[PDB]
PDB file of C-alpha atoms and ligand atoms in Angstrom:
ATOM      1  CA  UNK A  13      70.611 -32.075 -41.165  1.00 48.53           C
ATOM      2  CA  UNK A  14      72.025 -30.782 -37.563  1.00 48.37           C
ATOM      3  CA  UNK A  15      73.508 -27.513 -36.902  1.00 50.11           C
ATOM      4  CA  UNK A  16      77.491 -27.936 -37.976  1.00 52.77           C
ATOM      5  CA  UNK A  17      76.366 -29.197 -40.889  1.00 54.63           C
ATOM      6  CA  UNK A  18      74.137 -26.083 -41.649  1.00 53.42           C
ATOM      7  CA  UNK A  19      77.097 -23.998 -40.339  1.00 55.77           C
ATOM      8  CA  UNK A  20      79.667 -25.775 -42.726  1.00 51.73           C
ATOM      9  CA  UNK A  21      76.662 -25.453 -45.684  1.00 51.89           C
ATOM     10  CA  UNK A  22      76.334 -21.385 -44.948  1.00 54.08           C
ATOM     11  CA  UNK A  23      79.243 -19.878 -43.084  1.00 52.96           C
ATOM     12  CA  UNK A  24      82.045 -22.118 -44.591  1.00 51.76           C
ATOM     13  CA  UNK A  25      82.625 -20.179 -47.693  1.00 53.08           C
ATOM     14  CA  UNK A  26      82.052 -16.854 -46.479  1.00 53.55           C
ATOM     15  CA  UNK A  27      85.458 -14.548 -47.850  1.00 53.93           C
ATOM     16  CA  UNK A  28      85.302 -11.006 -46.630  1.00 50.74           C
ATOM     17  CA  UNK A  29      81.080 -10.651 -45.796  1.00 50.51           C
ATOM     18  CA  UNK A  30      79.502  -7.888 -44.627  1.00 51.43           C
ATOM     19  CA  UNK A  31      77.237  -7.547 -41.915  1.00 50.54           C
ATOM     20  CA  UNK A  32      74.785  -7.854 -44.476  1.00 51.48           C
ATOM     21  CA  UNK A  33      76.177 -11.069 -45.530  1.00 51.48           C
ATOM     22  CA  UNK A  34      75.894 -12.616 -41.845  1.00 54.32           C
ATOM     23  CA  UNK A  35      72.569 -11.366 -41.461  1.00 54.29           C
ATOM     24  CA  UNK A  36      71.269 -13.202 -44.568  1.00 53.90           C
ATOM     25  CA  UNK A  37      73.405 -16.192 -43.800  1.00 54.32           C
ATOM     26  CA  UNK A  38      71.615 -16.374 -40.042  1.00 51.21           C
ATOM     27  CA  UNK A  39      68.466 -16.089 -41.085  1.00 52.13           C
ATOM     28  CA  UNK A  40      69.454 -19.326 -43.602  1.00 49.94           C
ATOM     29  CA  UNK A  41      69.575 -21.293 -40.328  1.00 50.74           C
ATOM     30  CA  UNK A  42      66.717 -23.661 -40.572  1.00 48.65           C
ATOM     31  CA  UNK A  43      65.067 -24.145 -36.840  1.00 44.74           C
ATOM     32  CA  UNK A  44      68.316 -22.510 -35.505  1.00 42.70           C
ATOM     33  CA  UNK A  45      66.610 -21.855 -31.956  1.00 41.72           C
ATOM     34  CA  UNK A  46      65.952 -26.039 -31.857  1.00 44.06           C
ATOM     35  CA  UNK A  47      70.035 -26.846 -33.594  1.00 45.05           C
ATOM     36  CA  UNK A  48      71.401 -24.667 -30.957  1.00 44.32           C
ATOM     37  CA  UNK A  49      70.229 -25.694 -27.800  1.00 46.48           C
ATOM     38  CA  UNK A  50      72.903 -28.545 -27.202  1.00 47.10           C
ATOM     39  CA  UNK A  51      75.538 -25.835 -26.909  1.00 47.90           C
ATOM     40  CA  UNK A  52      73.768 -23.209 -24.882  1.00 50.56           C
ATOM     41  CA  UNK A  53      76.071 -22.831 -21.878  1.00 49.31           C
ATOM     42  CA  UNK A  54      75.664 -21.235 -18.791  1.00 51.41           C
ATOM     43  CA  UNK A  55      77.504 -18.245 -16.999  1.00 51.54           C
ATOM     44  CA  UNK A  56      80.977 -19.260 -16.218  1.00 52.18           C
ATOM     45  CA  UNK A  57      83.268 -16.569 -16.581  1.00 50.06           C
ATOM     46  CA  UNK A  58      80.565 -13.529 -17.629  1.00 47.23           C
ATOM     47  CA  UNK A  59      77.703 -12.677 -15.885  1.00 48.27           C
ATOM     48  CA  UNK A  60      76.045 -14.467 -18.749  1.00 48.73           C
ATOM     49  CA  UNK A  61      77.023 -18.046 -20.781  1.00 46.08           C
ATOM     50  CA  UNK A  62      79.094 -17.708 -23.944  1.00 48.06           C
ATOM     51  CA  UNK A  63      79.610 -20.723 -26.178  1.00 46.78           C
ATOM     52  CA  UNK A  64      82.132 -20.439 -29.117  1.00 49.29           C
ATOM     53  CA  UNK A  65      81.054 -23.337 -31.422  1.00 48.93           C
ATOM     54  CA  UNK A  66      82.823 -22.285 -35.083  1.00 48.50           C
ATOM     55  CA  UNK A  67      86.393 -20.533 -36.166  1.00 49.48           C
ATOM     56  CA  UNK A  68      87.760 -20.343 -39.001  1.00 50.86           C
ATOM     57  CA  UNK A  69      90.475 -17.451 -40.811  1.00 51.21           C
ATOM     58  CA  UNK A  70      86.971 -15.602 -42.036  1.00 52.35           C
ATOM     59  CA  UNK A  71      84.493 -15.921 -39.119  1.00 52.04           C
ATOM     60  CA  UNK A  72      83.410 -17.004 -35.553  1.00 54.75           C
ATOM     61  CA  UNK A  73      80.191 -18.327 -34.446  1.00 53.88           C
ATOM     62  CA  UNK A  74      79.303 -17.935 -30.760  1.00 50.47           C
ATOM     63  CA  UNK A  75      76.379 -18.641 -28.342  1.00 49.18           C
ATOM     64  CA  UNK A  76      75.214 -16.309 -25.847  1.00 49.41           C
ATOM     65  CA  UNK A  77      72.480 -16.741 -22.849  1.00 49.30           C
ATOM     66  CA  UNK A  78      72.091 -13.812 -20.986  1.00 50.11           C
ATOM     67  CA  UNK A  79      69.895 -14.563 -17.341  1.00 50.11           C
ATOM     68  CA  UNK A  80      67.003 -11.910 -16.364  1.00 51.15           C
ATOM     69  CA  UNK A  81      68.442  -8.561 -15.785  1.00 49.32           C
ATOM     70  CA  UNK A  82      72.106  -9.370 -16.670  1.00 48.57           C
ATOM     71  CA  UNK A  83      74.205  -7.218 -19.544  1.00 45.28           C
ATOM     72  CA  UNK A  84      77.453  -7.577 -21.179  1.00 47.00           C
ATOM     73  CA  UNK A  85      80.248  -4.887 -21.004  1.00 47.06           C
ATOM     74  CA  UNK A  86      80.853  -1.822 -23.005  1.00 45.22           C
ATOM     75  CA  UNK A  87      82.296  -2.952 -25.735  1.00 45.29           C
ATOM     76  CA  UNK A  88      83.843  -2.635 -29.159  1.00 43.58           C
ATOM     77  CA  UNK A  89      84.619  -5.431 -31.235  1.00 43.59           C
ATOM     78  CA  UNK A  90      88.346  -4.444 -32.262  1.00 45.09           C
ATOM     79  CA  UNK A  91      88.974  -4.680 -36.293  1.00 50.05           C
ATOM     80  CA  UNK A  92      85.905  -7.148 -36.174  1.00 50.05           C
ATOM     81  CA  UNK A  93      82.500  -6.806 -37.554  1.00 50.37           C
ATOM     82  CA  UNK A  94      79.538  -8.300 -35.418  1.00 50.34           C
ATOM     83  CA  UNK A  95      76.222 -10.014 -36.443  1.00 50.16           C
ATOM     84  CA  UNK A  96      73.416 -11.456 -33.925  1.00 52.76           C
ATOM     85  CA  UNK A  97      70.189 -13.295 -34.077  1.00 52.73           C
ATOM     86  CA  UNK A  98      68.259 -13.944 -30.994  1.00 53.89           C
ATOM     87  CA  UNK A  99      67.155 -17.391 -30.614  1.00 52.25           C
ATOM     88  CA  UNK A 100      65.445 -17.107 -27.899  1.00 52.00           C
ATOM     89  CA  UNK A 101      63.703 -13.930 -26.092  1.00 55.05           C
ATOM     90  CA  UNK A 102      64.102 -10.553 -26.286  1.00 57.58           C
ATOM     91  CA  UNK A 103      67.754  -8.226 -26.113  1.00 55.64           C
ATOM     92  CA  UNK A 104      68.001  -4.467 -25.379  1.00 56.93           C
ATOM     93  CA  UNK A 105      70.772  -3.356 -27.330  1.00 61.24           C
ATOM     94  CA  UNK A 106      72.419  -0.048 -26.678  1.00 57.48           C
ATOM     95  CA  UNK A 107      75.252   1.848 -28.612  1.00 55.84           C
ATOM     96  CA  UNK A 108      77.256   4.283 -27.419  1.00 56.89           C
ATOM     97  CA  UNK A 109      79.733   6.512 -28.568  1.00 56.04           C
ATOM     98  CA  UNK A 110      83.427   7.885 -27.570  1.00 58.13           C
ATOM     99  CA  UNK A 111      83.623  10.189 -24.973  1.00 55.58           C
ATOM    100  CA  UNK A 112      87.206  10.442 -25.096  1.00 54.91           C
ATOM    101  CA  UNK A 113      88.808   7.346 -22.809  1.00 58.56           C
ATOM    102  CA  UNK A 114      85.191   6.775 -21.742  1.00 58.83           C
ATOM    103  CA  UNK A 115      81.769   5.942 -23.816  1.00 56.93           C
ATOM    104  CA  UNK A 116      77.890   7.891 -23.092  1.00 54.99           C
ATOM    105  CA  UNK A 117      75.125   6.084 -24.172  1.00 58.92           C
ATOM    106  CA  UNK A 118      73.822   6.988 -27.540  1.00 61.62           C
ATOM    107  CA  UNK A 119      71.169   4.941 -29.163  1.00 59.99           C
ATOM    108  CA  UNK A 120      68.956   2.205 -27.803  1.00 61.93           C
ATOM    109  CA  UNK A 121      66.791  -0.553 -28.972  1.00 61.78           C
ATOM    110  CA  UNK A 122      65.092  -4.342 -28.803  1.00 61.29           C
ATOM    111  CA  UNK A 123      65.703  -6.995 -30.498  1.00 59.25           C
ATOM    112  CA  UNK A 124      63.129  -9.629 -30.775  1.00 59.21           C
ATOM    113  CA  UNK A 125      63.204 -13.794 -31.226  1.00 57.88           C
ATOM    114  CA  UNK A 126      64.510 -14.220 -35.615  1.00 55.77           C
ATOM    115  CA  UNK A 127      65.385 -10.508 -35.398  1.00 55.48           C
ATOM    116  CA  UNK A 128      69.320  -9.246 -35.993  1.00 57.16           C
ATOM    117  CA  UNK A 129      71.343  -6.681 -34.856  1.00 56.86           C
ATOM    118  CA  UNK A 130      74.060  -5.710 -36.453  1.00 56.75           C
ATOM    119  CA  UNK A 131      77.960  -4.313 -35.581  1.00 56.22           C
ATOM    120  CA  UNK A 132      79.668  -2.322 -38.070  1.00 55.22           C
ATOM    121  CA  UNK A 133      83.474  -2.163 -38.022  1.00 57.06           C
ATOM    122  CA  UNK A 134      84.071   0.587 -34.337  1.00 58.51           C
ATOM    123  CA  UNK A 135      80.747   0.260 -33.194  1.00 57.40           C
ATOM    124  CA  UNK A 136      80.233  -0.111 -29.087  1.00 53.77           C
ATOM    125  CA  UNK A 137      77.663  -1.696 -27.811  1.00 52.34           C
ATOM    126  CA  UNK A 138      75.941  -3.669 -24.410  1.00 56.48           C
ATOM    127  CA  UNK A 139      73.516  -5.995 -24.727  1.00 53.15           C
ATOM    128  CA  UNK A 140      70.977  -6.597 -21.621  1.00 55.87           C
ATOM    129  CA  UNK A 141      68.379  -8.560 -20.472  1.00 53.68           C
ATOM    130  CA  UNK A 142      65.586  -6.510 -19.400  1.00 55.81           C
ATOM    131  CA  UNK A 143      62.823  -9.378 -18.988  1.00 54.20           C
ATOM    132  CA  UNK A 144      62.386 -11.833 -16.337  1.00 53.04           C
ATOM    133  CA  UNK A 145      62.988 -14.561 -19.080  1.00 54.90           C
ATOM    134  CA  UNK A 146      66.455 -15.745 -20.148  1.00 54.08           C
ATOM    135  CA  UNK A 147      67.590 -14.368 -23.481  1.00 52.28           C
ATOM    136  CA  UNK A 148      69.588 -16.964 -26.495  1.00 48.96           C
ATOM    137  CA  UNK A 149      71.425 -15.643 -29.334  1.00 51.14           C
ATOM    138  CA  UNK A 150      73.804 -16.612 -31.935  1.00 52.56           C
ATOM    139  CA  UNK A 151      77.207 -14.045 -32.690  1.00 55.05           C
ATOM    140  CA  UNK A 152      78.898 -14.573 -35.899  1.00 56.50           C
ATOM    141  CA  UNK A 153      82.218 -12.000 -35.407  1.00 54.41           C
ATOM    142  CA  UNK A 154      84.217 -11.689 -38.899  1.00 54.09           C
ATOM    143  CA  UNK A 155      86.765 -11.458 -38.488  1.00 53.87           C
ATOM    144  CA  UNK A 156      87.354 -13.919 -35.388  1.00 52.39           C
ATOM    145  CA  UNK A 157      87.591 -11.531 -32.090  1.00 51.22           C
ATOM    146  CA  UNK A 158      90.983 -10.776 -31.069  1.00 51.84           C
ATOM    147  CA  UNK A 159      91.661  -7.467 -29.462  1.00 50.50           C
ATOM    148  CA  UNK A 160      87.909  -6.463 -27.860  1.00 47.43           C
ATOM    149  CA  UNK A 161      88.196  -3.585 -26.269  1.00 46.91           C
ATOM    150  CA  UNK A 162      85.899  -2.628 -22.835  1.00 45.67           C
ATOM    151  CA  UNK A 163      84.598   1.078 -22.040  1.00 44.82           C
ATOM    152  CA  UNK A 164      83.815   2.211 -18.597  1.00 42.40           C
ATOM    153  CA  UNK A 165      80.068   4.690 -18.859  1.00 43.93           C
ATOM    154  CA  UNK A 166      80.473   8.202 -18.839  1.00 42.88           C
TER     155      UNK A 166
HETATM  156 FE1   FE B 201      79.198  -7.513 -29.060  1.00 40.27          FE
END
């Protein structure tokens, strides 16, 4: 029992979840940390690794690794919902809010190894790495990303 074949088991049937859905279906994983680590990547294009492992018309399941003191952009997810688990470490997440053309920051928060954070449907968010450890966790995006959208702080 490897990690597609838990992904196929949980995700593959999915119509229309909520976050709530992807949250429970995550935390289904069994040893996800352990089934994941063949297809943690390293930072290529970002300033931190992103694997996309799963599509399908419903969902998108996607591997992060963000090095010590390295953040994604400001962003939005588009028409998408967002759900994450950290594998591995500790995330800040922050939210913001529109300021118009721009985004302040509004809300902040950790995340914690089997924890989840969740996107609803507009949300913007960053994640960072504010440890001296690297940080692992697993996206599911329903549905798959297609127009993200990336907000400069105000
Ligand atoms: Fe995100």
């Amino acid at each position: 029992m490897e990690l597609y074949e838990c992904i196929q088991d949980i995700f593959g049937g999915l119509k229309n979840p909520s976050v709530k859905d992807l949250a429970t279906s995550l935390k289904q994983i069994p040893n996800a940390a352990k089934l994941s680590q063949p297809y943690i990547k390293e930072p290529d294009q970002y300033a931190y690794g992103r694997n996309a492992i799963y599509r399908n018309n419903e969902l998108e399941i996607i591997v992060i690794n963000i090095p010590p003191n390295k953040e994604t952009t400001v962003h939005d997810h588009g028409q998408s919902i967002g759900c994450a688990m950290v594998l591995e470490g500790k995330l800040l997440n922050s939210i913001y809010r529109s300021t118009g053309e721009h985004a302040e920051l509004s809300n902040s928060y950790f995340v914690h190894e089997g924890e989840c954070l969740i996107s609803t449907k507009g949300l913007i968010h960053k994640m960072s790495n504010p440890t001296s450890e690297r940080m692992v966790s697993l996206h599911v995006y329903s549905p798959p990303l297609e127009d993200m959208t990336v907000f400069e702080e105000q």
